[PDB]
Amino acid sequence: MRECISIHVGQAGVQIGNACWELYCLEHGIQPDGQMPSDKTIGGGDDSFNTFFSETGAGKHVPRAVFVDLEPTVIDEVRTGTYRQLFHPEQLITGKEDAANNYARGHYTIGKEIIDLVLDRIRKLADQCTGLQGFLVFHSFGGGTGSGFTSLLMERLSVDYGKKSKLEFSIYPAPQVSTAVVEPYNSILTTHTTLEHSDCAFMVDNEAIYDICRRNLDIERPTYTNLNRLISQIVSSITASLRFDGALNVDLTEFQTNLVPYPRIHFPLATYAPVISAEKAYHEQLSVAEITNACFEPANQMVKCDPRHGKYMACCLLYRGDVVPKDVNAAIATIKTKRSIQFVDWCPTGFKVGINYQPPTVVPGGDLAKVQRAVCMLSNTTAIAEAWARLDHKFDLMYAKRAFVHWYVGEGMEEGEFSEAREDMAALEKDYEEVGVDSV
Amino acid sequence: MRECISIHVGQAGVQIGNACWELYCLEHGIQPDGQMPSDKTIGGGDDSFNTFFSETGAGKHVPRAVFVDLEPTVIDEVRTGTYRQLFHPEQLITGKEDAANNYARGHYTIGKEIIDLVLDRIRKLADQCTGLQGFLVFHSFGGGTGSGFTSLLMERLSVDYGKKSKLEFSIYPAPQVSTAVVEPYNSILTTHTTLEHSDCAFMVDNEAIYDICRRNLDIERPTYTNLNRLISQIVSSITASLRFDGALNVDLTEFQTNLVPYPRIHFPLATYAPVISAEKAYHEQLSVAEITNACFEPANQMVKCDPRHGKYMACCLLYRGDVVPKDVNAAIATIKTKRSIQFVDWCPTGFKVGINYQPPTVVPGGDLAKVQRAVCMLSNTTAIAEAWARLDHKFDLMYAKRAFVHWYVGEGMEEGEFSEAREDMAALEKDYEEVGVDS
Amino acid sequence: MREIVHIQAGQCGNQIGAKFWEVISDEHGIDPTGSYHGDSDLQLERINVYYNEATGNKYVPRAILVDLEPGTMDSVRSGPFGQIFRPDNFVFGQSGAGNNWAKGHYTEGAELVDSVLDVVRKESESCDCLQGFQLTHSLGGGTGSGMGTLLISKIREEYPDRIMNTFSVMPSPKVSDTVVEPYNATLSVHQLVENTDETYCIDNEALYDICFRTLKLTTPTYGDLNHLVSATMSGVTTCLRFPGQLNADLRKLAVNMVPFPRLHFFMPGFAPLTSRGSQQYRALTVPELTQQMFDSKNMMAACDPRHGRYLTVAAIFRGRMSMKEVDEQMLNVQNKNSSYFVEWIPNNVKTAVCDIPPRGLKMSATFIGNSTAIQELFKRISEQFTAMFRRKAFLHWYTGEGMDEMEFTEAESNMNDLVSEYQQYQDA
Amino acid sequence: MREIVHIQAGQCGNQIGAKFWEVISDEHGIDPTGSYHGDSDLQLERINVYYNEATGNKYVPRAILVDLEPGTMDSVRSGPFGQIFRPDNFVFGQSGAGNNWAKGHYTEGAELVDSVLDVVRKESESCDCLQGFQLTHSLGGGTGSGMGTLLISKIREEYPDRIMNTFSVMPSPKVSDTVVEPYNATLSVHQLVENTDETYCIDNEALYDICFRTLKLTTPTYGDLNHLVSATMSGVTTCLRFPGQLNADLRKLAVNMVPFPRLHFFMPGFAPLTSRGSQQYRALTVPELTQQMFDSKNMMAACDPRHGRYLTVAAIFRGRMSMKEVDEQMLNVQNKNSSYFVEWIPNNVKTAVCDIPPRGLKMSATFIGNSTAIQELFKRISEQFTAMFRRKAFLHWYTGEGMDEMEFTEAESNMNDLVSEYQQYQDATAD
Ligand SMILES: Nc1nc2c(ncn2[C@@H]2O[C@H](COP(=O)(O)OP(=O)(O)OP(=O)(O)O)[C@@H](O)[C@H]2O)c(=O)[nH]1
Ligand SMILES: Nc1nc2c(ncn2[C@@H]2O[C@H](COP(=O)(O)OP(=O)(O)OP(=O)(O)O)[C@@H](O)[C@H]2O)c(=O)[nH]1
Ligand SMILES: Nc1nc2c(ncn2[C@@H]2O[C@H](COP(=O)(O)OP(=O)(O)O)[C@@H](O)[C@H]2O)c(=O)[nH]1
Ligand SMILES: Nc1nc2c(ncn2[C@@H]2O[C@H](COP(=O)(O)OP(=O)(O)O)[C@@H](O)[C@H]2O)c(=O)[nH]1
Ligand SMILES: COc1ccc(/N=N\c2cc(OC)c(CCBr)c(OC)c2)cc1O
Ligand SMILES: [Ca+2]
Ligand SMILES: [Ca+2]
Ligand SMILES: [Mg+2]
Ligand SMILES: [Mg+2]
Ligand SMILES: [Mg+2]
Ligand SMILES: [Mg+2]
C-alpha cells in the first residue's frame, strides 16, 4: 500500500538504479531471482517493502521501477547482470541513438520518439497499485538524456498524474568526472524546466561524493562504482522510512512537510555518517554522538557549500540501527551548544528525528565498513544556494560568447529559452536570499 | 369536612414529601399497605385524618398527594420504597430530562409540555373532594424543576382553583448542600413569580437544618436523610391542626388569618424545640417553660436570623404532648419580661396557643429521641428579611456581570425578566423595612 | 437513560480513546470480551451511560472509531480490549490526512464524513435519552483536528440541542510531529469556540513537563503521556459513571461551569501523579491530595493558575475518606488562595466524593477549573502561528487544497478575541 | 550499432586510407582475410563501428575506395589487406584529374559522382544506426581535393543530420606535388568551412619537419610521412573503437570541441613521436607524455600552440598507467599553461584512457586541440595563394573548365574571415 514507482533515466540514473536495487534486495532478503524466503504471503500482501516491490503468483518480487535510456549499452548491462532476472524486459526501455550531451535532443529530437512508450510502461506499473503515492526520478543534470528527456518526462507526468508527488534524486556536475563541456547549459535548462513539476529534489554533488570517497574511504581514484555505492546508501536511508516499519519510524511525507516551506524552496541538503573504511572501522566503534556531530561537518555533505554561512529552516535526522532516543537527545543538546545552528526567525528551531531499527547493509566487495548505527541528516539551509551560484556562473561565462549554443539552436531551440532558464535561476537565487532575511 | 391536596415538585419536594407521608402514617396508625385497624368506618368516614387520606372500598388509606419530577430516578424510589403500596401509579408523574438547574428550562421549555398532564392528574384528586380547602406545595428554591416548574404550577392553580388556598414549604438554598451555582438566580425568579399566588410560605433554610443536625444530633456530615427527617417533624407539627381534632388552624385559611396580615409579607419563621439525640439514652425532660423559652433562641430557628432586631406581627405556639394550659401561661409570663419581644403597634402583642395531647412520633431507627412534650412556634417577624437580603446580594454579584444569563435567555426567557424579579425583591425588602423599622 | 455517544478520530484521539475504554472498563468490572466480572452493584447502576447492553448479557461501548488511514485502526483492533468494540463502528479511509487540517476538514475527510454520520445516528437511534457527544482528538494533526471539527459541525446540525463535549490535546514544540501544528491548532480552536459546549484542554506541553520534571522520566513516550491522559479522563468522568449525592450529566456540568458561552475551555488537574509501574505504598492524607491537586505542577495545561482567576471550580475525591476532612481541606484551600477566585460568583467551588477509587490507588482527586489563566495557552499557540503566518511559510500545503489566506486571518483574529475576553474577567 | 561509413578519394586519400585499415585491423585482431584472430574481448565490442559482419565470421571494412584514375586502386588491392575490402566498393574512373581542383569538382568528378553515391547508399542503408561519414583526402590534388568536396556536398544533401568528418591533408612545398597546390587548397578549405562538422588538419609541412628534425630522416618519403598519419588516425579514433564513454561517438566529439560552427578544424598531436629513432633511454612516464604532447614539435600541424589559445582540448592516453597520475599531470599542464586557455569556456580539457596501447608501444598519448593558433596554417596557404592569384598565374587551367575569377576571390575572402574569426576569439576575455 502507498506504492512508489522509481524511474531511472540515462546512464547516471540507470547505474544508480542498479546500486539501489541491489542494496534494497540485500536489505530485505530478496534473492537475485526475485525469491524472498522470509515472505510468507504468496502473490501479494501489504507489507512495508511492498511499497517498492510487487509480487507474482510464483513468489517473485519485482521492483516497481522503469529504466530508460536513449541508447542500450548501459541498460544492456542490467539485462545481463547479476540481477537480470529481477526485472521483466518491459521495464527496461532503450533507444538506438542518445542525446549527444544535448538537452535539445533529449527533450525533442530523439526523446519525442520514445516518450509515449515510456509513459505506457509507467501506466502499466501504476495500474498495479492500490494507492500510488508518487514517483522517484533518478537522473543526471549534465547528460543529454538525464536533463532533456527527464524534463520531457516530468512535464508529461504532471499531465497524466496531476499533482501526484514527484521526487528527484539528481546528480550535480563536477569537473573531476564531467564528460561534457556543455553540462552547465543542460543543468540550467533542466532545472528551470522541472522546478514547477517537482515537489522535492535531492542533489548529489559529484565533487562532494568524490572527495568523501578519497578522504574517508582511502580510494586513490574513485570511479562511478565507488560514487554509486555511497549514493545508494543515502538513497536507502531516505526511502527506508517507506520500506520498513517501526515504533519510531517516521514517514518521508512527514519530513516533506517540514522540509519545503515554499514550493520553489524544495532542495534539501543531505549528510551521511559514518563513511569509514574497514581498516579504520575495525578499532573504533562510533557512538550516536560521534555520528551526529559528523552531520554538521561541511566535509560530509552531499553538496559543496558552507552551512554556517546560511540559515536553517528545517533539520531532520534519520537514524538507522542500534540507536535509542535517549542517546539522540543527549547528542543534539551538546550539538546545539558547541555548534552554530542558526535558524530563520519564522520557524521553530527543532530537530525532527526518526529511528529505523533495521541496521545498515553493505554490498559484498564494497568499500564501506559494516557499522551498527548510521544517520542521514536532511536539512533545508539557504547555504545550498552556493551550488546554484557556482553552476550559474559557469553558464554565464559561456553564454556571454554564445559558445556551443548552435548545437541547441540547430535542434530547434531558441536563444530565448536560454535567457528564460537563466532568468529563472536568477530569481531562485534571490528567493533564497529573501527567505533568510529577518522579519519586520 | 374539607380536603387538602399536597403537591411535591422536584427532588427536594419529593424526598421531603416521602419523609412526611411516612411520618403521617406512623402518627395516624396507617400501615405501609394502606390499612388502618384503628379506623372503624371502612372505605368511608369524615374523620380529621380524612383531610389528607381518602379511602377505598377495600379499606386502603390513600394520601391526597401528587408527586411530579421532570426525571424519574427520584420518584422511582417512592415507586419501589417501603410505602410503594400506598400510592396509585397516576399519583407519580415523571418526565424524561430535568431542568438542568435552570429556572427558564423548568418554567418554559420542559414546563410547557408537562403542565397539562399534571393539572389533569390533580383534577382527578380534586373531583374526589367534597369541600377542598386548597393545596400544600413542596419544592426547593434552587432546583430548575423546584423553582421553574413550581411557579408555573402556582400560576395555573390560581386560574383553575380561584377561591382555594395555596400553602408553600420552600427549601432555601445553602452552600453546604447546594448543588448548583445559579441557585440564587432560580430563587429570585421563582419568588417573584409565586408571590401573588401563595397565601403563606414556610421557608426552611438548609443551613439552619444542617447546623441543628450537627449541633443537637451529633451528625458530622448530615445527608438529605437526616435533613429531611427533621424537616418533616416541623412540617408535621405545622399540619397537625389539619389532620387532628382541634380548634386552632383547622383549615388553610386560618394559617393566613392568624399569620399573614399583609399579603406580600407572608413568610412566617418556624422555631422548633426540643431536638434531642436519640443516642442520648438518659436525658432530662424539658418543661413547658424550658421548651417555650428555647423558641426564642436563634439556634433553633428554621432560618438563621435575629428576631430581637425586628418586630412581630403574629405569634403562634403549637405544643404536642404533655402540656396543661396553666404551664403555658406561666411560661409566656416569664419570656415577656426576660426576652425582647416587640410587636408592631398596629397589632395586638400576644400569643395564639394550640395544644395537641398526642406527643410527637419519631420514625423508628431515626435520629431524634422520643419526647413527652414539644413545641413549634410560628411567628411573622420582620427579622426574616435578612434571608431576602443575603439572597438579593448574591443575585447582584452575578447579575452585575451577566454571568450564566445566556443559559436562561437560550430557553426563551427574556433578560428583562431578571430585573423585573429583582425589582420585586427590592420592593419586598422595603416592605419589611417599613413594617418594623424605626428612626 | 442519559446515554453518551463517544467518538475518537485520528491517531491521538484513537490512542487516548482506546486507553479511556480500557481504564473505565476495568473500573466497571467489564473484561475484554464485554462480560461483567465485578463485585459491586455500583459498577452497573449507570453502566448504560457508556455501554449498550448486548443480546447475551455482555456490554459493548457506545464508541465510534474514525480515521483517514487504517494504521491506528489495526493497532486498536489488536490491543487488549480491541475485541470489545462493535466491528461495524470502525470507519476509516486509506489516504490519510498528512498532518494537514485542510485535507481532514475539506478534501479527504469530505467523503468519509457521511459514513461516520451514518453510524452516529444508528448509535443515537438506539439511545433512550441521548445526552450528548464526547470526542477525543488532537488539534495539531489533520484527521482529528480537521475532520474532528468537521464532524462536530455535522453533528450539531442534526442534534442542535444535545451537548457537545471534547477532550482536545494541544500541540507543543516539546512533543512535535510537524511544524504546521500551530496552523492546525489555530484553525481548530476557532471551530471549538463556536461549536462545542465543553472542551477539556489537555496540553502536551504540560504532559511532557510532568513526565520529565516531576515523574523523573528522561525520554518520555506517548505511552507515558497517555497514562496521564487516561487517569484524567477517568476522574473527570467519574460523576457521569457512578451514582452519588450529585447525579451529574453533561448539561448540568455546562450550566454550572460556563458563565459566558465562549469561555468553555477547562484546565484539568489530577493527584497523585503516578507512573506506569508506580508503587503507591504510602497513601496520601486528604490534606496532601488537596494541596497537590491545586499546585501548578499537577495541571494538565501549561498555565500558572496564580497568573489568573478561577471562575468556577469542580473537584471529585475518589476512595474511602472522611467526607468531613474533604470539606474542611477544600474550604481551607479557598481561604489560602482567596485572591485566585473571582468574588462575583458566590460559592463557585463545588466538590463531590465517590467511594470507588481507580485501579491501583487507595484515593485520588481530580479537578476542573474554568480559569482565565487558560489564556496563556492560547497566547502560546498564537505566537507560533504568527511567526510563520507573518511570512506565509508552509501555507502552500493548505492553499493547494482550496483554502484561502483569509480563513487563516479569520481563525487567528477570533483566537486573539478569546484571549481578550479571558483578560476582561481577570480584572473584575 | 554506431556505424561510420569511410570514404577514401585520390592518391593521398587511398594511401593513408589503406594504412589506416592496416593499423586498426591489427589492433582489433583481423587478418587480411577478415577472420578474427585476437585474444581480448575488448577488440570486438565496438567492431561494428568500422566493420560489417560478413557471413562466416568475416569482418569487412565499411570503406568506399574512389579515384578518377585506376593507378592507386590497383595498388591498394595488391598491398597488405587488399583482399579485405569489398570489390564492389571500388569506384575508379580513367580520365584522371591532372591535379586540377576544377576537374574533380565540376567536370570529371561530376561524371563519376553518381556511381560513388550508389555505393554510399548501399552501405548507409545497411546500417543499424548510421552515425556519420569520415573522408580521407588531400587538399592539394585534383581528385580528393575537387571531387572529395563534391562528394561531401552530395552526401550532405541526402544525410543532412549526420556527422561529416574529414582527414584533410594540407600541402607543403617541402613535399610539393604540383605548383598549383595553393589554389586547390584554398578552393577546398572554402568547402570544408561550410560543409563539414569536424576536420582534422594533417599538415604535410609538419609531417616533413618531424621526419627531418626529430626522426632524423634526410630523405623522407611518402611512406615515412604516412607512418605519422596512421599513428594519428589510430589514436584520434581510439575512443570510437574501444569500450568507454567520453567522445564515444562523432557527435559527442563535435558538441564538446566545436563552440562555433565554422571553427571546426582540429590540431592533432602525438607522443612518443620517436617511432623508430636511435635514442633509447626513453623511459616514458605519464609526466613526459603530457609535457611532449603539448609541445609544438609534436603537432601534426605546423602551428605553435603558444602563439594562440586553446578553445577546447581532448587528450587520450593508451596503455597501462595510473589514472591518478594522468589526472594530476593533466591538471599540472593547465595550471602551468593557464595563459593559453580561454577562461570563458570552463573545464575545456577532457581526458580519456584506454587499456589497449598501439602496436609496439608500452604507452602512447594522442591530443586533439581546437586552438586559435591554427590561423598560422591558413595564413600560410593564403599568402601562397595570393602570390599566384595576384599575377593571375595558371588561372586558365581553371577557367577552361568553366570556373570564373569570382569563385577564386570568394574562397579567398572566406578563408581570410576564418583567420579573422580565430583571432577574434583569441583576444576575447571573460571580463
Ligand atoms: N554519480 C554518477 N554520475 C554519473 C554516472 N554516470 C554519469 N554521471 C555523470 O552524469 C553526467 C553525464 O550524464 P550521463 O548520465 O552520462 O548522460 P545521459 O543522461 O545518458 O545523456 P546522453 O549520453 O547525452 O544521452 C556527468 O556529470 C557524469 O559525471 C554514474 O554512474 N554516477
Ligand atoms: N432539604 C433538602 N434539600 C434538598 C433536597 N434535595 C435537594 N435539595 C436542595 O434543593 C436544591 C436543588 O433542588 P432539587 O430539588 O435538587 O432540584 P430539582 O427540582 O430536581 O431541579 P432540576 O434537577 O434542575 O430539574 C439545592 O439547594 C439542594 O441542596 C432534599 O432532599 N432535602
Ligand atoms: N498526548 C498525545 N499526543 C499525541 C499522540 N499522538 C499524537 N499526538 C499529538 O497530536 C498531534 C498530531 O496529531 P495526530 O493525532 O498524530 O494526527 P491525525 O492522525 O491527523 O489526527 C501532535 O501534536 C502530536 O504530538 C498521543 O498518543 N498522545
Ligand atoms: N602524406 C601524404 N601525402 C600524400 C600522399 N600522396 C599524395 N600526397 C599529397 O597529396 C597532394 C596531392 O594530392 P594527390 O593525392 O597526389 O592527388 P589526387 O589524387 O588528385 O587527390 C600533395 O600535397 C602530396 O604531397 C601520401 O601517400 N601521403
Ligand atoms: C459550579 O460548579 C459546578 C460544576 C459542575 C456541576 N455539575 N456536576 C458535576 C460536577 C463535577 O465536578 C466536581 C463533575 C466531576 C468532575 Br472532577 C461532573 O462530571 C464531569 C459533574 C455542578 C456545579 O455546581
Ligand atoms: Ca508477500
Ligand atoms: Ca374511615
Ligand atoms: Mg547513456
Ligand atoms: Mg430533578
Ligand atoms: Mg501523526
Ligand atoms: Mg599525385
Compact description:
Helix content of chain A is 42%, strand content 16%. With 440 residues, chain A is α/β, with parallel strands linked by helices. In chain A, strand 10, helix 12 and strand 11 (352-356) form a beta-alpha-beta unit.
Anisotropy-based shape of chain A: globular
Q: Spell out the CATH superfamily of the largest domain in chain A.
A: Tubulin/FtsZ, GTPase domain
Q: What is the rounded distance between the termini of chain C?
A: 40 Å
Major β-sheet of chain A, in short?
6 strands, parallel
> What would CATH call the architecture of the largest domain in chain A?
3-Layer(aba) Sandwich
PDB class: cell cycle
Keywords: Drug-tubulin-complex Cell cycle inhibition, cell cycle
Entry title: Z-SolQ2Br bound to tubulin (T2R-TTL) complex
Chains A, B: Tubulin alpha-1B chain
